[PDB]
RNA sequence: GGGAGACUGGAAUUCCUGGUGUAGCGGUGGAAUGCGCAGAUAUCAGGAGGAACACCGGUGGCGAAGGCGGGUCUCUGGGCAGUAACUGACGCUGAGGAGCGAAAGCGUGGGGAGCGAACAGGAUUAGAUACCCUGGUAGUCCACGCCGUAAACGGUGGGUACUAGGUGUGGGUUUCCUUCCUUGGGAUCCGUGCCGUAGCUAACGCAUUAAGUACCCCGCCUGGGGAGUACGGCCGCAAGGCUAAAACUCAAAGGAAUUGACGGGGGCCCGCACAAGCGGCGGAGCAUGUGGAUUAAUUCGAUGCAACGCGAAGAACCUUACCUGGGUUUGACAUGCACAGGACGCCGGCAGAGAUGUCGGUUCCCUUGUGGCCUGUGUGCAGGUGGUGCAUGGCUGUCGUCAGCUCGUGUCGUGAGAUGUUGGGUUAAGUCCCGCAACGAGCGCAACCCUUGUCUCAUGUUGCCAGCACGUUAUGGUGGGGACUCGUGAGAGACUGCCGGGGUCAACUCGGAGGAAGGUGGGGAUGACGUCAAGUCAUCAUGCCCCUUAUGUCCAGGGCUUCACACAUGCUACAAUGGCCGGUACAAAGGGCUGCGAUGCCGUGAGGUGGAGCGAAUCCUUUCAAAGCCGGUCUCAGUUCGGAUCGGGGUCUGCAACUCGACCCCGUGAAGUCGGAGUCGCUAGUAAUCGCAGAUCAGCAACGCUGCGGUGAAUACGUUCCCG
RNA sequence: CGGCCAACUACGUGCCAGCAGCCGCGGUAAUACGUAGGGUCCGAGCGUUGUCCGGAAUUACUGGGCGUAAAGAGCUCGUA
């Protein structure tokens, strides 16, 4: 990235879903490329949080990143020969992007003894605001605000 | 090490094999008699400058095909050289064994030979520089030969410090594959060891 | 701290008076060290001069500290060694005592790498010597609504205007009032239902615009470092916006 | 602002007093000593005291030099210009000598706000007698005196005359534009800078203010240390200053400039370098290599990147070069000079661990001169994985696939050298364009080669089967057919070709159409001059040295596999994104003759018997896979995880699995709960994960190496920091 | 008998023995050590040491310099 910035790679829409969170998400959860499995366990979490809660998968989905997308961050900045944490404003596909790998990485500490039913139940506890990612998103906006002095540059 | 050989570098594109024969199950004995008859005719002939040697077999029969700048030396007016390689070569297990013997059209423009001379030159005592410099102007004057580079290292001059030194002349782009470079190395034995020459010369391109 | 000494050939003893000189470095690196290594061999040639050859590698926290020297025995190879690994320690701290004479100093004096980047205005400095006012807009006194001062805003691409309200008959300046939208000052504070009805999204500045002199003006905006300044002049006894223009002049729109 | 004396002005710092007023102030890269809560800091008012004089204020003025600016007054020195009234060579320099002489320092008496050696703590550091912080004595100030040193420098002694100019600026006289305001301009005298001729210099540079051309006088130098030191002497209250050696030692010490290299110097750029991410190593068991230790030997080489699953693409014997022991010597193997020969050679027996020794049967064809074989006798000689990769060739690594490295002629410089190769722009690029004392060229870059992505023509077997017939389940299996793949030949197709816009209308760049592919499409092969005396006398060759009844050569056994530890590379795991069981679908590439080896049969299983068909688009590797999908079970536990270790029983290869093979079956069931400091790989069909094949190979230590495909992500805001 | 400075090869030795006026030669293949051939310069002489002059323009009268190589007194006044 020393010449410029790179391209994106343009993810496609989701069959069952028809949204682009999901197959984001289904991306997230991937491992060793075995994305069938990842297909089966996120189907299988979004048909547990409708039967849960009795709606649709995708707006309970948006509620959950909505309570735990970031708005501001803090960064390692070196100015003057010197190091400091400075909070910096997170665009949206960063934001959207710690809000998933959050929601699929602490999702992945649960014990729930499955991978579905952690995941259920990480997305319906963000969607309520209880999960553990609104936590850390709690967290990470208060050490954000605790060095806004550092903000001028 | 920084440069592969030329000749193994365009064996695909410009210049061509020097053995010429099937062999499937008889690769290896085939392989075998063929470095054999190698060896046999370098060791056999040294005043001759021998250019080339070319082998091919077909079941029974092979025609090596040798090149030399003298043809005279190796050949006998009664076949008594003739007779000799023809002796020496059926004892290497070749059966029906029949020799070409050939002479070379321009004995300067070829890499080897040129290789050849500069090493018995340097061998005895002249002195390097008048053995590159000699070399060189006798190529240039070759209508076809564009560009040439010779290059010795080792001892040269009886030091006790190995050098390595080099003239070129012309166009030498050792990188382009469609350019022909002819290749000559050579190991001159002096009292004081082994002094390694290398020629590079450059004719045309072909496509 | 522990050294591995991986020697070769016939050097008696070596071993261990390398071990031992090469041990009491660990207090010099200010960092601890990992697995530090040292290699000992002879040239078989007698006709070198110095045969004996001896490298050391040490692992100071992550960063690699390697040296070799040649000596006429092992003693020798080990002790001008131990001066060159002393060196490279000495030359590899990193610690705040070794970092301070570099990292830039003062606020104007000097120039470095990473020293600060000057701050710089948009407008070319032209300092107060010879500032001048050179340009004087009256571009637009009809009375307009917040909507239509908005758009004669945006075609004229400039952060601020001044106009007079249609409700108040009041002279008022609107500006980008940043993420909260646009922003409104009068010369005399109203509210927004006394203001001409409005669809676009603003909010009132509650100060007003005080009265204050040519000279008083520009020492306001130089100390107070807003793009523009709007006051009611104290001879004119009218509204004034005083803005630094692209020259280092200052922009004085007047009626 | 030349000097001395006297009087005096304001801002600000410090302290004191009195109001308002609270809980911090101060300080740093970050903090702590410190101050304050007994009322600090802050704010206002008043008072006391000391020192220095913001703006004017500069490469500007004065002074012999040191040096000299708040204001006013008194006393006083010097300089410049004009008139040229006056004297009439009264001039210049000056050994010694006298005087002035920054700061620091000394003596006596005062003063003491700020700063501040010394001295205390605080902080950083491995150590801080320092840099940074809080305090702080002499001193800095005044009066009278001492000392007599400075990078007291323009590192340039004083006086004079001459030698192109151009332009700032200070002071004074005058002519002409003429408003006569105006640096109008000119002329001239005296200063003070910058640029530049001639000239001088080793060069840098000086150049009317000479470091130029010459004259007068003075001071100083004769290689570097020892040493401006010792002794003696003079001065000084003291510190110390002035004059000033020698012994001894070195073969140099130096001045300027050039090319590199380096910088915790700057500027412009690149790279999985960092940043954002994904997966790891470092923790555990095992495989492999190395260090160390051990041993009779643990053969040798390789030590950052660029040694350490490396030489070793296959160590039970052989390999093998090491150890023990047993034999052998023109030798285990070549070729030449000789004497004797018809046997060499084999095949069986015996002894021996074998080498080997011995016994028993077989005996040459030429052609008379002898040749082929060996015997011994020999004699040249062989033979060395014995030493020196600092004597070497050849081969290879690395910087680095980075863009750089040079040459001819010309030009500049006394010369090393410089230009070209720099400057602006652009690029992946010393790629290109524009300029240019340079004009060109060569090796480098790019292209020409291979593969891959699209299409056309040709093409039908062992390959396809779409349309037709026969099929028997067993399927292109069979007759048949070029239609679609595929196989392999030829060709086309990407060339900024076209359009729009930036651009010096130039390189080049942004976007768009078309196309399978758009801007070196993706990946390879290709590695400039050279660097590191890089690696290899153990692929090979080789100069020199060494052994030669041995360091050569044959054999058996052992070793290279030893293990209290250390380092490195990998594999398997710690589990539910999973384990086990059943069913079920898709690849590519490669190999095969004394080899691949099927059907069938026998074992639970390695495997055994057997041999169909195949030198292979045909047969075998199964028709090929595993991850994958479906169903059942396990239910978060040191477990139905993990497989180490160990006991017993077998298969295969090999003359032989003890040291020291792999695999199969039963039992056994360790550490291990995602791993500290630190560290590695990766930008897309990539990382991750799954399986297949090959080389070496009788068998394998293969989890290694080289290829093939299956499923297939996240992230890159941007060059501040780290490395190159 | 390496270059100054006429005149080179072999053997012995190997950082030893040693050579040397200076630079500097001895690290199994030395024209620099020792010995042999060969050669060159001199010759009843040949070399070494000691002393003086020259080369030394290196005390510069003939015939040197002081910005940076050593060298302008810290600056003036003034006696001979």
Same mark, same amino acid.
């Given at each position: 990235?020393?010449?410029? /910035? +790179?391209?994106?790679?343009?993810?496609?829409?989701? /069959?069952?879903?028809?949204?682009?969170?999901?197959?984001?998400?289904?991306?997230?959860?991937?491992?060793?490329?075995?994305?069938?499995?990842?297909?089966?366990?996120?189907?299988?979490?979004?048909?547990? +949080?409708?039967?849960?809660?009795?709606?649709?998968?995708?707006?309970?989905?948006?509620?959950?990143?909505?309570?735990?997308? /970031?708005?501001?961050?803090?960064?390692?900045?070196?100015?003057?020969?010197?190091?400091?944490?400075?909070?910096?404003?997170?665009?949206?596909?960063?934001?959207?992007?710690?809000?998933?790998?959050?929601?699929?990485?602490?999702?992945?500490?649960?014990?729930?003894?499955?991978?579905?039913?952690?995941?259920?139940?990480?997305?319906?506890?963000?969607?309520?605001?209880?999960?553990?990612?609104?936590?850390?998103?709690?967290?990470?906006?208060?050490?954000?605000?605790?060095?806004?002095?550092?903000?001028?540059? | 090490?920084?440069?592969?050989? %030329?000749?193994?570098? *365009?064996?695909?594109?410009?210049?061509?094999?020097?053995?010429?024969?099937?062999?499937?199950?008889?690769?290896?004995?085939?392989?075998?008699? #063929?470095?054999?008859?190698?060896?046999?005719?370098?060791?056999?002939?040294?005043?001759?400058?021998?250019?080339?040697?070319?082998?091919?077999?077909?079941? #029974?029969?092979?025609?090596?095909?040798?090149?030399?700048?003298? %043809?005279?030396?190796?050949?006998?007016?009664?076949?008594?050289?003739? #007779?000799?390689?023809?002796? #020496?070569?059926?004892?290497?297990?070749?059966?029906?064994?029949?020799?070409?013997?050939?002479?070379?059209?321009? %004995?300067?423009?070829?890499?080897?030979?040129?290789?050849?001379?500069?090493?018995?030159?340097?061998?005895? *005592?002249?002195?390097?520089?008048?053995?590159?410099?000699?070399?060189?102007?006798?190529?240039?004057?070759? %209508?076809?030969?564009?560009?040439?580079?010779?290059?010795?290292?080792?001892?040269?001059?009886?030091?006790?410090?190995?050098?390595?030194?080099?003239?070129?002349?012309?166009?030498?782009?050792?990188?382009?594959?469609?350019?022909?470079?002819?290749?000559?190395?050579?190991?001159?034995?002096?009292?004081?060891?082994?002094?390694?020459?290398?020629?590079?010369?450059?004719?045309?391109?072909?496509? | 701290?522990?050294?591995?000494?991986?020697?070769?050939?016939?050097?008696?003893?070596?071993?261990?008076?390398?071990?031992?000189?090469?041990?009491?470095?660990?207090?010099?690196?200010?960092?601890?060290?990992?697995?530090?290594?040292?290699?000992?061999?002879?040239?078989?040639? =007698?006709?070198?001069?110095? =045969?004996?050859?001896?490298?050391?590698?040490?692992?100071?926290?992550?960063?690699?500290?390697?040296?070799?020297?040649?000596?006429?025995?092992?003693?020798?190879?080990?002790?001008?060694?131990?001066?060159?690994?002393?060196?490279?320690?000495?030359?590899?701290?990193?610690?705040?005592?070794?970092?301070?004479?570099?990292?830039?100093?003062?606020?104007?004096?000097?120039?470095?790498?990473?020293?600060?980047?000057?701050?710089?205005?948009?407008?070319?400095?032209?300092?107060?010597?010879?500032?001048?006012?050179?340009?004087?807009?009256?571009?637009?006194?009809?009375?307009?609504?917040?909507?239509?001062?908005?758009?004669?805003?945006?075609?004229?691409?400039?952060?601020?205007?001044?106009?007079?309200?249609?409700?108040?008959?009041?002279?008022?300046?609107?500006?980008?009032?940043?993420?909260?939208?646009?922003?409104?000052?009068?010369?005399?504070?109203? =509210?927004?239902?006394?203001?001409?009805?409005?669809?676009?999204?603003?909010?009132?500045?509650?100060?007003?615009?005080?009265?204050?002199?040519?000279?008083?003006?520009?020492?306001?905006?130089?100390?107070?470092?807003?793009?523009?300044?709007?006051?009611?002049?104290?001879?004119?006894?009218?509204?004034?916006?005083?803005?630094?223009?692209?020259?280092?002049?200052?922009?004085?729109?007047?009626?």
């Amino acid at each position: 990235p020393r010449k410029g /910035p +790179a391209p994106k790679r343009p993810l496609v829409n989701d /069959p069952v879903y028809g949204s682009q969170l999901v197959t984001q998400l289904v991306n997230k959860v991937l491992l060793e490329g075995k994305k069938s499995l990842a297909e089966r366990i996120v189907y299988g979490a979004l048909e547990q +949080a409708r039967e849960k809660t009795g709606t649709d998968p995708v707006v309970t989905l948006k509620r959950a990143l909505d309570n735990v997308k /970031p708005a501001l961050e803090v960064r390692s900045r070196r100015v003057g020969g010197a190091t400091y944490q400075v909070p910096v404003e997170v665009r949206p596909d960063r934001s959207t992007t710690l809000a998933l790998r959050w929601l699929v990485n602490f999702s992945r500490q649960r014990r729930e003894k499955t991978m579905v039913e952690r995941l259920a139940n990480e997305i319906l506890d963000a969607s309520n605001g209880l999960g553990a990612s609104v936590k850390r998103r709690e967290d990470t906006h208060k050490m954000a605000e605790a060095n806004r002095a550092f903000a001028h540059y | 090490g920084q440069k592969i050989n %030329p000749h193994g570098f *365009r064996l695909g594109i410009t210049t061509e094999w020097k053995s010429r024969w099937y062999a499937d199950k008889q690769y290896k004995d085939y392989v075998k008699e #063929d470095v054999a008859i190698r060896k046999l005719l370098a060791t056999g002939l040294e005043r001759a400058g021998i250019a080339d040697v070319e082998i091919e077999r077909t079941r #029974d029969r092979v025609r090596v095909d040798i090149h030399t700048a003298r %043809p005279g030396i190796v050949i006998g007016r009664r076949g008594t050289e003739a #007779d000799r390689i023809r002796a #020496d070569l059926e004892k290497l297990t070749g059966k029906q064994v029949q020799l070409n013997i050939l002479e070379v059209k321009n %004995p300067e423009s070829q890499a080897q030979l040129v290789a050849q001379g500069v090493a018995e030159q340097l061998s005895n *005592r002249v002195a390097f520089r008048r053995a590159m410099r000699k070399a060189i102007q006798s190529a240039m004057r070759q %209508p076809n030969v564009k560009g040439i580079r010779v290059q010795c290292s080792g001892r040269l001059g009886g030091a006790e410090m190995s050098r390595s030194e080099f003239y070129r002349e012309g166009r030498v782009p050792l990188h382009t594959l469609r350019a022909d470079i002819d290749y000559g190395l050579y190991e001159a034995k002096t009292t004081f060891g082994r002094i390694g020459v290398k020629v590079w010369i450059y004719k045309g391109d072909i496509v | 701290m522990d050294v591995d000494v991986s020697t070769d050939g016939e050097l008696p003893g070596a071993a261990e008076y390398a071990r031992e000189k090469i041990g009491r470095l660990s207090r010099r690196a200010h960092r601890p060290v990992l697995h530090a290594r040292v290699r000992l061999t002879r040239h078989g040639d =007698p006709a070198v001069e110095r =045969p004996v050859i001896a490298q050391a590698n040490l692992d100071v926290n992550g960063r690699q500290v390697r040296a070799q020297v040649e000596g006429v025995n092992a003693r020798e190879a080990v002790d001008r060694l131990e001066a060159r690994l002393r060196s490279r320690l000495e030359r590899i701290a990193e610690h705040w005592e070794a970092r301070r004479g570099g990292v830039p100093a003062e606020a104007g004096r000097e120039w470095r790498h990473e020293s600060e980047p000057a701050r710089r205005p948009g407008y070319f400095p032209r300092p107060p010597e010879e500032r001048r006012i050179i340009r004087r807009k009256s571009f637009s006194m009809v009375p307009c609504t917040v909507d239509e001062a908005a758009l004669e805003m945006e075609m004229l691409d400039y952060d601020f205007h001044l106009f007079t309200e249609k409700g108040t008959g009041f002279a008022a300046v609107l500006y980008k009032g940043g993420p909260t939208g646009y922003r409104l000052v009068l010369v005399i504070p109203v =509210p927004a239902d006394e203001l001409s009805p409005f669809e676009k999204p603003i909010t009132i500045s509650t100060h007003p615009a005080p009265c204050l002199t040519q000279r008083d003006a520009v020492e306001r905006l130089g100390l107070l470092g807003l793009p523009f300044l709007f006051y009611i002049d104290a001879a004119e006894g009218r509204a004034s916006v005083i803005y630094r223009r692209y020259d280092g002049h200052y922009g004085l729109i007047t009626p």
